[PDB]
Amino acid sequence: GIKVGVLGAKGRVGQTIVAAVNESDDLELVAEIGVDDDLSLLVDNGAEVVVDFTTPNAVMGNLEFCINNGISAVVGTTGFDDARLEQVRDWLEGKDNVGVLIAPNFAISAVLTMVFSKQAARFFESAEVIELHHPNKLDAPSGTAIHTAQGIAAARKEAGMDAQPDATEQALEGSRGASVDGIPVHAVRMSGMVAHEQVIFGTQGQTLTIKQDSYDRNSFAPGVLVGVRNIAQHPGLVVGLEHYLGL
Amino acid sequence: GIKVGVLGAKGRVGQTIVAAVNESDDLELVAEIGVDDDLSLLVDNGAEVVVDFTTPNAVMGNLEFCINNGISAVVGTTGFDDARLEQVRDWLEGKDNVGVLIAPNFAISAVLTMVFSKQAARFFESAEVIELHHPNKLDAPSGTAIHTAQGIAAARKEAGMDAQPDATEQALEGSRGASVDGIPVHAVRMSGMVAHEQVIFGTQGQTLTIKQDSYDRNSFAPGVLVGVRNIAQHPGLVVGLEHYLGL
Amino acid sequence: GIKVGVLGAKGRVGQTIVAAVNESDDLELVAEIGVDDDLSLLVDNGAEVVVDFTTPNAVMGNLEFCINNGISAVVGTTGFDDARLEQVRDWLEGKDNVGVLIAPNFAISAVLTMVFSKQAARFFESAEVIELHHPNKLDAPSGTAIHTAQGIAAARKEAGMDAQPDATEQALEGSRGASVDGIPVHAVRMSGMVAHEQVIFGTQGQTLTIKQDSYDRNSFAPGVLVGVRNIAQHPGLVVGLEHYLGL
Amino acid sequence: GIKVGVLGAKGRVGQTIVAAVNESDDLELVAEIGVDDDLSLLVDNGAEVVVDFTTPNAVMGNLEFCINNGISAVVGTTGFDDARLEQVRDWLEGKDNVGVLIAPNFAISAVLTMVFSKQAARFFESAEVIELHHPNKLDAPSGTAIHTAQGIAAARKEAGMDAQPDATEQALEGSRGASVDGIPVHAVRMSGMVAHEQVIFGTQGQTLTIKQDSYDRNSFAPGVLVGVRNIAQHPGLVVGLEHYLGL
C-alpha cells in the first residue's frame, strides 16, 4: 500500500503510531525523526505520506518541506490559527497531487459522536451533554464537550429551532450544567475513569444517546490511519477527520 | 401549513396522532375515519396528506383512492410484500405531485440508530447489539434488533471486512447472543422496561455506543410528523423514514 | 394473608394501589375511602393495615384513629415535621401490636440506591450524582438526588474522609454541578424521560455505578406492598422503607 | 500504621502493589521476595502482614510459615480447594492474634456489585446479567459474571421466589443468554473494552442497574489494602473481601 514516515516518533504518542504501522499489513514504515533532525531522509527513503506530531515551532517548516517534495501529511499537532491555515492553503495552490489533513481530534468515536450529534439535533426538542474524565484534568468542560455542544447549537440555529423545554423555577447554582450556545454541558471528574462523552437527545416518548468512551490514551491511532489510508484522495487542505469519513 | 386526515383514527394509536396534529401549530386536522367508512369525505374536506393505520385488508384500497385523488400518504400499516409495493409503484407512474411513504418504523430514535450504526460500522472491528424489552414480549430478538444487525452486517460486507475478534475457547450456550449475519444480538426481558436498543462498536482504545430508549408506546408520533411535514417533497414511493431524514 | 383498606383511594395514586392489592394473591382489599368519609367502616370491615394518601390536613386524624383501633398504617402522605412525628410517637406508647411507617419514598429502586450509595461511599475517593427527569419538572436537583448526596456525604464524614480529587483550574460556571455537602449533583431535563438517578463512585482503576430508572408514575406500588407485608413486624414508628428492607 | 511484606513482588501484579504501599501514608513497605527466596527475612524485618501472589505450589508453604510466626496474610493466589482451606483452617486453631484472607476477587467495585445484587434480588421479579470484556478473553461468561448470577439465584431460592416472567414464544438460539441457575447472563466481547459487569433488576414501573467497570488491569489494589488495613481485626480464616467490608 503506502510508505510512511513519522515525525516526533519518540514521544509517548510516537511509539504507539510507529507500532500501529508495522502491525498494519498495508503500510510500510519508512522513517523516524527525533524532532528537528534532517528531513531529506524522507525523500532518500521515498515516503508517500507522513504523520506529524512536532512542536508547533517546527511543524510549519516540515509541512512546507513535505508539500514541496510532494509528500502528503496527517497532522495532529495543535496550534493552527487561521493565519497558519492560510499559510498552508497558500503552500498548496495548483498541486492536486498532495494533501494535508489537520485533525484537532483523531478519536474516531469522538469524531463520529460530534458528527452524528449534529445530524440528530434537528429532530429532538431536548439535548444535553455530559462529559467525564479522570480527576487530574485541568479544565471543565473538556474542549471536545464544548465543541460538541456548539455543533449541536449550530444544527439547531440552522434549521431554526427554539430554546428547549425547562420549567425550572429558580434552579440551584451549578445544577443545570454550563450553558454552551444554549446547550447544557455537565462535567464529571471521576477517579478511575479516563475520557468519555455522552450526548442525550429528547423527544416525545423517547431518547437517543450517543456515548463515546476512551479506555486508553492511544485511541487516536485508528484516526491517524484513516487519515493515512485516504489523504491520497483528498488533495489540498482539510481540517477535521469528519471529512475523510465520507459522510 | 397542511390539511390532514387520519384513517383508523380510533385505535390506541389513532388518538395519539389525532392529538399530535391539533397540538401542532402548522397542521390542520381535517378528518377522521372509523375504519371502512366513506373516503369521499377527504376530498369534501380537501385533505393534502393522510396518515393511515388501517387493517392490511383495507389499506391498499384507501391507498389507491388517495393516490387517485392526488392525496399523499404516510403509512405505518404492516404487511407490504414486494407484490404490494409493486402495486403501489404501479399506481404512482407519472404523477410527480403525490407521494407515499411506508415506514416499517416511526421511532426516530430507533430509525436514527439503525442509520448511524450503518454509517459507523466500517470503522470498528467489533460490533454487538443488545436489545431490551418488557417481559410480555413474544419474540427475541426484537425485529428492530435484527434489522439493525443486518444493516451493520451489510455495511461491513460492503467495504469488505473480516469477522470479528473473539478468542472464546468453547463458550457456554446462549452466552454470546444470537448470530445475525455474524452480529451478536442479546435480548433482555426485564419487568419495568419498555423498549430499548443499544449498539456497541469497538476499536483500539475506544468504543462508541448508540442507544435508543422508548419510555412510552407513543414514540411513533414524531416519526409520523416528519413524514407528513415532508412527503410533500418526496413524490413517488418511499420505504423507510431514513430517506425522509435527508442523510 | 392480610386485610387492607385504602384512604384517598380515588386519586391517580389510589387506583394503582387498589389494583395492586386485588392482583396480589395474599392481600384481601377490604375498604376504600373518598377522602374525609367515615373511618368506622374500617373496623366494621375488620382491616389489619391501611395505606394512606390523604391531604396532610386529614392525615393526622386518620392516623390517631387507626392507631387507636389497633390498625397499622403505611403512610406516603408528605408533610411530617418533627412535631408531627412527635405526635405520632406519642400516640404509640406501649402498644407493641401496631406500627406506622412513613416513607418519604416508595420507589424501591430509588430507596435501594440511596441505601447502597451510603454503604459504598467509604471505599471510593470520587463520587458524583446525576439525576434526570422530564422537562416539566419544577426544581433542580430533584429532592431524591439531594438526599442521595447528603447520605453519601454523611457516610464519608463518618469514616472520616477528605474532599475529592479535582484539579480543575477555574472551571466554567455550572459545569461541575451543584455542591451538596461536597457532592456534585447534575440535573438533566430531557423530553421523553421520566425519572432517573445515577450515582458514580471512583477509585483507582475502576468505577461503580448504581442507577435507578422509573419508567412510569406508578413505581411506588412495590414499595407500598413491602410496607404492608411487613409493618406487621415493625411495631411503633418507622421512617423510611430502608428500614423495612432488612439491611 | 503497618509493616508489610510482599511475595511474588516482581510480577506485573507485584509492582503495582509495591507502589500502592509506598504511596500510602499509613503502610511501611518492609520487604520483597523473588518467589522462593528466604522467608526468614520477614521476621528479621518485623513484618505485621503480608500480601501474597505466589504460584500455588509455593503458597501453602509461605502461608504455614507466616502463620507460625504470627504474621497475617492477604492472599490473592488462586487454587484453594476445600482441602487447602481445610489445611489452613487447621494451621490456625487457637491463635486469635492472626488472620488469613483469601479473596478470589479484589476488585471492590466487582465485589460490592456481587454483594449488592444479592441484597437486591429479593425485591425484583426480573433480573439479568451482562458482562463485557476485551475480545482476547478465553471464556464466556466471565467467572465473575457466573458467580454474580449464582448469588442472585441463591438470594431468590432462599426467600422463595418463582422463575421470572418471559413470554418468549420459541426464542432464537443464543438470544436470551446462558442460563445460570435461572439467571440470564450475556457475554459481550468488544475491542477497546477491558472488564465490565452490569446487573439489571426489574419490577413494576422501574429498574435498578448496578454496573462495575474496570478501566485498567490494576483495580485489585484498593481491594488488597482494604485487606491489609483490616485483617488485623479478623483473626482466623476468611474467604471473600465481602466479609472485610462490614456489610
Side-chain angles (χ1 to χ4, degrees):
Chain A
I2 310 290
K3 294 166 205 254
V4 178
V6 178
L7 321 198
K10 293 174 171 211
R12 224 107 152 187
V13 198
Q15 311 325 148
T16 126
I17 311 147
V18 177
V21 197
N22 304 121
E23 182 188 333
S24 184
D25 57 89
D26 74 290
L27 286 310
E28 231 58 48
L29 162 58
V30 170
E32 178 216 78
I33 310 294
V35 151
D36 79 352
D37 304 64
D38 215 292
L39 328 87
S40 57
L41 189 50
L42 277 329
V43 187
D44 304 356
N45 286 117
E48 289 165 72
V49 162
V50 314
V51 173
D52 183 306
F53 285 92
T54 74
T55 156
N57 291 307
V59 68
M60 282 288 187
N62 336 272
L63 263 172
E64 169 151 77
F65 180 88
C66 292
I67 297 176
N68 280 347
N69 319 142
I71 328 229
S72 288
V74 177
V75 192
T77 295
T78 32
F80 275 97
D81 29 303
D82 329 40
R84 281 154 140 273
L85 287 338
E86 174 43 28
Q87 249 154 125
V88 167
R89 190 128 48 204
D90 168 62
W91 295 166
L92 284 164
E93 284 324 281
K95 317 265 145 141
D96 32 72
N97 247 216
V98 56
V100 180
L101 163 79
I102 312 205
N105 198 340
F106 278 118
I108 322 305
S109 41
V111 178
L112 254 358
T113 289
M114 296 294 161
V115 184
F116 294 153
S117 313
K118 234 186 159 212
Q119 294 186 67
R122 100 173 136 293
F123 307 105
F124 304 83
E125 30 277 25
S126 284
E128 305 201 17
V129 185
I130 301 165
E131 158 262 278
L132 320 87
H133 278 97
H134 65 264
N136 329 100
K137 174 157 190 121
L138 255 289
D139 52 293
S142 74
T144 341
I146 321 213
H147 285 234
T148 307
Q150 291 183 151
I152 279 152
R156 295 177 73 86
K157 162 79 196 282
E158 142 82 77
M161 263 172 145
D162 0 42
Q164 17 175 110
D166 182 25
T168 307
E169 195 150 18
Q170 184 63 230
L172 241 91
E173 264 168 51
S175 71
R176 301 278 302 107
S179 205
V180 176
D181 291 340
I183 309 301
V185 186
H186 295 100
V188 175
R189 299 273 155 286
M190 181 70 52
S191 153
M193 299 196 76
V194 177
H196 316 260
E197 226 174 72
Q198 183 154 333
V199 188
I200 318 173
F201 286 110
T203 304
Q204 222 232 314
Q206 65 208 123
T207 70
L208 175 53
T209 323
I210 292 152
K211 33 136 76 189
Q212 94 82 34
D213 305 80
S214 300
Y215 294 87
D216 188 27
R217 289 138 297 128
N218 69 12
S219 46
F220 55 78
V224 170
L225 305 209
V226 167
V228 169
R229 305 250 184 87
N230 298 59
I231 186 158
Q233 292 127 241
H234 288 100
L237 171 64
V238 190
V239 188
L241 254 179
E242 52 266 36
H243 305 291
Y244 276 38
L245 302 170
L247 314 162
Chain B
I2 310 290
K3 294 166 205 254
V4 178
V6 178
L7 321 198
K10 293 174 171 211
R12 224 107 152 187
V13 198
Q15 311 325 148
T16 126
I17 311 147
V18 177
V21 197
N22 304 121
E23 182 188 333
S24 184
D25 57 89
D26 74 290
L27 286 310
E28 231 58 48
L29 162 58
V30 170
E32 178 216 78
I33 310 294
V35 151
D36 79 352
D37 304 64
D38 215 292
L39 328 87
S40 57
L41 189 50
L42 277 329
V43 187
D44 304 356
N45 286 117
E48 289 165 72
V49 162
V50 314
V51 173
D52 183 306
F53 285 92
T54 74
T55 156
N57 291 307
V59 68
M60 282 288 187
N62 336 272
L63 263 172
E64 169 151 77
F65 180 88
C66 292
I67 297 176
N68 280 347
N69 319 142
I71 328 229
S72 288
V74 177
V75 192
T77 295
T78 32
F80 275 97
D81 29 303
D82 329 40
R84 281 154 140 273
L85 287 338
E86 174 43 28
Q87 249 154 125
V88 167
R89 190 128 48 204
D90 168 62
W91 295 166
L92 284 164
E93 284 324 281
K95 317 265 145 141
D96 32 72
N97 247 216
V98 56
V100 180
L101 163 79
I102 312 205
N105 198 340
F106 278 118
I108 322 305
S109 41
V111 178
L112 254 358
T113 289
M114 296 294 161
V115 184
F116 294 153
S117 313
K118 234 186 159 212
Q119 294 186 67
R122 100 173 136 293
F123 307 105
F124 304 83
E125 30 277 25
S126 284
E128 305 201 17
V129 185
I130 301 165
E131 158 262 278
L132 320 87
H133 278 97
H134 65 264
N136 329 100
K137 174 157 190 121
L138 255 289
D139 52 293
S142 74
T144 341
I146 321 213
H147 285 234
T148 307
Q150 291 183 151
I152 279 152
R156 295 177 73 86
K157 162 79 196 282
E158 142 82 77
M161 263 172 145
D162 0 42
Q164 17 175 110
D166 182 25
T168 307
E169 195 150 18
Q170 184 63 230
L172 241 91
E173 264 168 51
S175 71
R176 301 278 302 107
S179 205
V180 176
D181 291 340
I183 309 301
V185 186
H186 295 100
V188 175
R189 299 273 155 286
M190 181 70 52
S191 153
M193 299 196 76
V194 177
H196 316 260
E197 226 174 72
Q198 183 154 333
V199 188
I200 318 173
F201 286 110
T203 304
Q204 222 232 314
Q206 65 208 123
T207 70
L208 175 53
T209 323
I210 292 152
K211 33 136 76 189
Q212 94 82 34
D213 305 80
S214 300
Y215 294 87
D216 188 27
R217 289 138 297 128
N218 69 12
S219 46
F220 55 78
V224 170
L225 305 209
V226 167
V228 169
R229 305 250 184 87
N230 298 59
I231 186 158
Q233 292 127 241
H234 288 100
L237 171 64
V238 190
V239 188
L241 254 179
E242 52 266 36
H243 305 291
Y244 276 38
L245 302 170
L247 314 162
Chain C
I2 310 290
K3 294 166 205 254
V4 178
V6 178
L7 321 198
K10 293 174 171 211
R12 224 107 152 187
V13 198
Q15 311 325 148
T16 126
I17 311 147
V18 177
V21 197
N22 304 121
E23 182 188 333
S24 184
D25 57 89
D26 74 290
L27 286 310
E28 231 58 48
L29 162 58
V30 170
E32 178 216 78
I33 310 294
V35 151
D36 79 352
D37 304 64
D38 215 292
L39 328 87
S40 57
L41 189 50
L42 277 329
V43 187
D44 304 356
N45 286 117
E48 289 165 72
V49 162
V50 314
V51 173
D52 183 306
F53 285 92
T54 74
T55 156
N57 291 307
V59 68
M60 282 288 187
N62 336 272
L63 263 172
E64 169 151 77
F65 180 88
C66 292
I67 297 176
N68 280 347
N69 319 142
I71 328 229
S72 288
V74 177
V75 192
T77 295
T78 32
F80 275 97
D81 29 303
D82 329 40
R84 281 154 140 273
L85 287 338
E86 174 43 28
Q87 249 154 125
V88 167
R89 190 128 48 204
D90 168 62
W91 295 166
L92 284 164
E93 284 324 281
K95 317 265 145 141
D96 32 72
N97 247 216
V98 56
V100 180
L101 163 79
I102 312 205
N105 198 340
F106 278 118
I108 322 305
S109 41
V111 178
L112 254 358
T113 289
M114 296 294 161
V115 184
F116 294 153
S117 313
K118 234 186 159 212
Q119 294 186 67
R122 100 173 136 293
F123 307 105
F124 304 83
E125 30 277 25
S126 284
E128 305 201 17
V129 185
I130 301 165
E131 158 262 278
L132 320 87
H133 278 97
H134 65 264
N136 329 100
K137 174 157 190 121
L138 255 289
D139 52 293
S142 74
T144 341
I146 321 213
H147 285 234
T148 307
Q150 291 183 151
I152 279 152
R156 295 177 73 86
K157 162 79 196 282
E158 142 82 77
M161 263 172 145
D162 0 42
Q164 17 175 110
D166 182 25
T168 307
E169 195 150 18
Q170 184 63 230
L172 241 91
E173 264 168 51
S175 71
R176 301 278 302 107
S179 205
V180 176
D181 291 340
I183 309 301
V185 186
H186 295 100
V188 175
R189 299 273 155 286
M190 181 70 52
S191 153
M193 299 196 76
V194 177
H196 316 260
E197 226 174 72
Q198 183 154 333
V199 188
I200 318 173
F201 286 110
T203 304
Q204 222 232 314
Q206 65 208 123
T207 70
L208 175 53
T209 323
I210 292 152
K211 33 136 76 189
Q212 94 82 34
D213 305 80
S214 300
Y215 294 87
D216 188 27
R217 289 138 297 128
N218 69 12
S219 46
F220 55 78
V224 170
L225 305 209
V226 167
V228 169
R229 305 250 184 87
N230 298 59
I231 186 158
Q233 292 127 241
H234 288 100
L237 171 64
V238 190
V239 188
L241 254 179
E242 52 266 36
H243 305 291
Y244 276 38
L245 302 170
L247 314 162
Chain D
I2 310 290
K3 294 166 205 254
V4 178
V6 178
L7 321 198
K10 293 174 171 211
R12 224 107 152 187
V13 198
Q15 311 325 148
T16 126
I17 311 147
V18 177
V21 197
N22 304 121
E23 182 188 333
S24 184
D25 57 89
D26 74 290
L27 286 310
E28 231 58 48
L29 162 58
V30 170
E32 178 216 78
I33 310 294
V35 151
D36 79 352
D37 304 64
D38 215 292
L39 328 87
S40 57
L41 189 50
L42 277 329
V43 187
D44 304 356
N45 286 117
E48 289 165 72
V49 162
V50 314
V51 173
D52 183 306
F53 285 92
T54 74
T55 156
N57 291 307
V59 68
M60 282 288 187
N62 336 272
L63 263 172
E64 169 151 77
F65 180 88
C66 292
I67 297 176
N68 280 347
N69 319 142
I71 328 229
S72 288
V74 177
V75 192
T77 295
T78 32
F80 275 97
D81 29 303
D82 329 40
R84 281 154 140 273
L85 287 338
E86 174 43 28
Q87 249 154 125
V88 167
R89 190 128 48 204
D90 168 62
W91 295 166
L92 284 164
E93 284 324 281
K95 317 265 145 141
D96 32 72
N97 247 216
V98 56
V100 180
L101 163 79
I102 312 205
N105 198 340
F106 278 118
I108 322 305
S109 41
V111 178
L112 254 358
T113 289
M114 296 294 161
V115 184
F116 294 153
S117 313
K118 234 186 159 212
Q119 294 186 67
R122 100 173 136 293
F123 307 105
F124 304 83
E125 30 277 25
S126 284
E128 305 201 17
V129 185
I130 301 165
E131 158 262 278
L132 320 87
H133 278 97
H134 65 264
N136 329 100
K137 174 157 190 121
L138 255 289
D139 52 293
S142 74
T144 341
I146 321 213
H147 285 234
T148 307
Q150 291 183 151
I152 279 152
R156 295 177 73 86
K157 162 79 196 282
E158 142 82 77
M161 263 172 145
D162 0 42
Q164 17 175 110
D166 182 25
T168 307
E169 195 150 18
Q170 184 63 230
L172 241 91
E173 264 168 51
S175 71
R176 301 278 302 107
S179 205
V180 176
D181 291 340
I183 309 301
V185 186
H186 295 100
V188 175
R189 299 273 155 286
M190 181 70 52
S191 153
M193 299 196 76
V194 177
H196 316 260
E197 226 174 72
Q198 183 154 333
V199 188
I200 318 173
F201 286 110
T203 304
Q204 222 232 314
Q206 65 208 123
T207 70
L208 175 53
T209 323
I210 292 152
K211 33 136 76 189
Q212 94 82 34
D213 305 80
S214 300
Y215 294 87
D216 188 27
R217 289 138 297 128
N218 69 12
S219 46
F220 55 78
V224 170
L225 305 209
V226 167
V228 169
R229 305 250 184 87
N230 298 59
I231 186 158
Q233 292 127 241
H234 288 100
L237 171 64
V238 190
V239 188
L241 254 179
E242 52 266 36
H243 305 291
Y244 276 38
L245 302 170
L247 314 162

